[PDB]
Amino acid sequence: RFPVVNTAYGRVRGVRRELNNEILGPVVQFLGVPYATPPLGARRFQPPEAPASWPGVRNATTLPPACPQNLHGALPAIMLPVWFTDNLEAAATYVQNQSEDCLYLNLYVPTEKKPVMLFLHGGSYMEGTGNMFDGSVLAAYGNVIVVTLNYRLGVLGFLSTGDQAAKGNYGLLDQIQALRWLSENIAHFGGDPERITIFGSGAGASCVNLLILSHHSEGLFQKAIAQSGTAISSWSVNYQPLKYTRLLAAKVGCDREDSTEAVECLRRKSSRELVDQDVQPARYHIAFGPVVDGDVVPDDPEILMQQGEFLNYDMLIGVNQGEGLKFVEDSAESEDGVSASAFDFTVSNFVDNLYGYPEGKDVLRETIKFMYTDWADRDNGEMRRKTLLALFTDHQWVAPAVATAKLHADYQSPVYFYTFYHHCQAEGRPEWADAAHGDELPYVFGVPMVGATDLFPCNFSKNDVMLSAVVMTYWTNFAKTGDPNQPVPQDTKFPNRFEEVVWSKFNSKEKQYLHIGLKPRVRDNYRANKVAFWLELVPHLH
Amino acid sequence: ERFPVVNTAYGRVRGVRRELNNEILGPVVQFLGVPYATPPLGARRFQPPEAPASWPGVRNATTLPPACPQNLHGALPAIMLPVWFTDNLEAAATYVQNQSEDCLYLNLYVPTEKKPVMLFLHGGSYMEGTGNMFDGSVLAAYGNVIVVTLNYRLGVLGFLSTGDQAAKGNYGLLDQIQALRWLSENIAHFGGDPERITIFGSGAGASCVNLLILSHHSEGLFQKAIAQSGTAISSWSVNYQPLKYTRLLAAKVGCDREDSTEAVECLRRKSSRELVDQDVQPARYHIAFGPVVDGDVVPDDPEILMQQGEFLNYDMLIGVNQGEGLKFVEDSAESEDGVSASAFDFTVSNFVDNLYGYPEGKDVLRETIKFMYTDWADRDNGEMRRKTLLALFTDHQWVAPAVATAKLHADYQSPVYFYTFYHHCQAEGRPEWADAAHGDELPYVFGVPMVGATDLFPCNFSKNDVMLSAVVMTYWTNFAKTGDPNQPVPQDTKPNRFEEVVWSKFNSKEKQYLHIGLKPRVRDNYRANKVAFWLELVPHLHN
Amino acid sequence: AGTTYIFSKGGGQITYKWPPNDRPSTRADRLAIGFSTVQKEAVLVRVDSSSGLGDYLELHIHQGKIGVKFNVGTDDIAIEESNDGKYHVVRFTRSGGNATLQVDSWPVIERYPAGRQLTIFNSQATIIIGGKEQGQPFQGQLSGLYYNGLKVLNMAAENDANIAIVGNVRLVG
């Protein structure tokens, strides 16, 4: 019972695996399927090329190797999912076959023309792998084909110099290349070509936003999703590619004045050699990643979407309640609250790192100082921690997210907004904590539906498992006709309050969204007061 | 006796024994037009008050004394005047009908039921007000306490100063001080305790009472005080440029002598009636004539005195109505829609320029405040933007300055119970969307509803309102005796919402206050979000 | 000579507490005591404000001379009568910043502090005498203490709850 299909590049053989759960049937998986040429020699730091055809039958039924990434290398935990840090060893188990050739993708096919859902992994622009998430529950649950893959990361995916010598942004070129392959391959797979959609989180979410504005994305996918991430966050894209690249070469050893010569230096160094190096970027910024090349990124993401130069695609956005858990880490281990002096200290380092504006800093420091401080219990201390956490969350995740949603809605595009509040009852996670960034992923993949794992050692519950089920329905349904309610009105299939609440469109004038959680219900705004602050008042302080 | 007589250090007076229209309270022995100072008619004009010469025989003190000089057909400041005062303007004029420079007289409302002493300060503005407007009988009939109303020099005649010895101004306060001294050495004869003298004023009067609290001259002439709707540090509370306003006054008069003393003499030779009729228009949210920093009455700016804690710990009651700047929202007050975006900013821009007039930092304040007072849940609704505009002004002039008063006083271990009024009486002129406005509490203090609708407040009231009207005065009188608005007389209807309520103090750390109204309750921080913006943030944006 | 209080070996104190809601605040004050001691260094009578308030009155001994220092909110200013074991009476009075002092029939010494200054000993809380807790407990004899219409030692003889005795003290009779 080993299925076989004939791709445009040859025939491949999958595995008809089974699941512990009963209501979900067997699922067919093809693992480590290539979709482009291994960028090994001169092909390194070049746009991806079509994969080489193979004779006979491909034996693709095993997890492919991971892309080069020094996990233990010091990296900013702020922008990575919390689970990715609490279970570093679990990932290390997953990322143990680091090979420069990693341009493969792992498919998933249900049993019972369906849509195709492409995932983007990676909290940052350097870590993660497609194998991290054994996404198979969704496929059968939504009778959809789940696609996960790996892409060139940082040094090997986005190195730039501002010139043709180092274009960078190659990671995206891997993405579209993967999209292109799926367009001409998924045809004889049951996938619906007019229902190709892309989604991700964190760094990936940033990529999704970038993908939407690319000129290389004409057609291909139609809808898209992006949770906990935008294209406007400070870490969305780099703005000093030369400096970081230059100091990298000096660290490498051959930092020739000519960019081309430096490219040869890098192209003559082994993958493991260059990747293991550490470059420390300025806090809340990315050492490597997409830049303003023009080929894939005509300009800074906010600039284009003003002009709205893209073919309005149906999109889903959301953000968890508090997504900056690590941003309060040093003080998270104090029995009492955060000291007033310390809180101001932390706030003081926040403003300069992000603005540092000579024109006036104390004004911004003062304005934010007063604003994000609930005056009812001024001396709570505990509350001060919450605000400090919240503060970060709005500026980096919520406020940018609302802006992009408005802009997309402004150009008459189907835009749907949600927010996540519920979270696992993890033992490591503090009880007072809340839904952290990326925490929705296990509920996106129904990890509880199939039991905890090394990724997520959570004591799930009946409420938790069902919550994921309803979550999938929305995502799956939206992937059918662009509506989280049209194809299948939700049903528990297991006091369900999810059958009555109806997702509403997100109009700019009235910011209707969905409050995913234990008690779902629609609201008119998400901390409206704060959102306007980071979008209207602050800019007027030039 | 239905026509009783009593004795004072200056002779003897004859009073009446009026009976109130109610059927629960007993009789009151009133006294009308009692002198307490020499009428400053001639050279005494613009001189400190002097105690009056004793009269022989018995004085027929049973008629309303003449009102002090003041104009009604003129450019009075409507921003700070109580709403009812501007509404039934001609009704007020009826009371101010016998203007005379010998206006220094005071009344009493001795009830029958030592009696506690309650003294009142009137005045919506500093150039307006006759004590006779308010019938003190009812309160004295309910609390078994002494109600006293008095007149004092007003307008230019009371607050004219050059800043030099030739003219110090601030006379009105002196006259009020003198009366207090008069009440110190006379009330006992009427049966009122001299050791429990309480002063309660509103509006411009509220500004007066605080000045007394900071006075050096008022060291032991009372023990308790009340205040409401504007304490000490409003833009209009105290003038600071008397010289500039005097110079143009004399110029318009005609004799703008280079020297003040020469200018002083000419004015002293000019008829009082002419001075009142002359027009002076001060900058918006500022007072042309009023108390000024002199040295003998107020040594320095009230803020400076308050910051360092210069006062003899008199227990205080301070409160403000929810929405008070009703008159400030005037142009759009009669619009079916709300305030437009084009007209909203303009209001704020004008407001900022008038008070925070500064070219260096103008927009930073203009933008910041613009955002602060706007509920983004209904950004484009418009109608709710009117309320916040009303909320904007009222916060700055009354709420925040009052809060600063309480915190500072409480910081120096002085008993202070903060309060706040939300209920109101349906008034024909007042709009439906309005709320308890500036001056919608004086009737309740005097218990006018007990009597019922009157000329000043034609708007009738419900039985429910009547019940509350008793509640507030019970609190007031409760305080007058002991200081705890609960201690002496437990609350009762005489169901009752105000039965279990316990009015706590106002600690600086925990800003507990009493929310009086239909459903009295104890809250903890009145509009905490906004108040902080007006006392901690906004100062920093002036460098 | 009058109501005599004796501070034995080590000394003690009578402590008088104002009711919380009846703490006074007076611009001018009157102080008067009659001591009998020969100490070359000590502090006689200290009176500080409530917590958080720096206004305070101290009447002390420095090099055997009787000096008085005080603050009303701005700063300290000290005046001294530049003790032989006998009943010598010292009267100390003030009016805001203005300060005057005199001992027995000796010529009066007065101070006129310069500059704008606060003028109220805000919110007095309690009265300390003898310096028991100041590091200089007083050992001698004290009669005729007086304070702006309040002679506490006389109230001490009346056994009032507001008043509390502590340390080494003896009473005549």
Ligand SMILES: *[C@@H]1O[C@H](CO)[C@@H](O)[C@H](O)[C@H]1NC(C)=O
């Ligand atoms: C390779 O293919 C053979 C038969 O074609 C199969 O038995 C074996 O499991 C496959 N192994 C992998 C790693 O694909």
Ligand SMILES: *[C@@H]1O[C@H](CO)[C@@H](O)[C@H](O)[C@H]1NC(C)=O
């Ligand atoms: C998880 O822990 C909670 C409390 O410690 C307990 O109630 C629950 O049964 C546990 N679940 C599992 C699967 O261990």
Ligand SMILES: *[C@@H]1O[C@H](CO)[C@@H](O)[C@H](O)[C@H]1NC(C)=O
């Ligand atoms: C007081 O007024 C009454 C009534 O007008 C009058 O009969 C009486 O003679 C008057 N007495 C004096 C002293 O004015």
Ligand SMILES: *[C@@H]1O[C@H](CO)[C@@H](O)[C@H](O)[C@H]1NC(C)=O
């Ligand atoms: C008195 O006020 C009430 C408001 O409750 C109103 O219904 C009634 O018509 C008023 N009566 C008069 C005579 O104005």
Ligand SMILES: *[C@@H]1O[C@H](CO)[C@@H](O)[C@H](O)[C@H]1NC(C)=O
């Ligand atoms: C206190 O000193 C000041 C400054 O010399 C003086 O003006 C004032 O009259 C003095 N007061 C008394 C009571 O001596």
Ligand SMILES: [Ca+2]
């Ligand atoms: Ca002081």
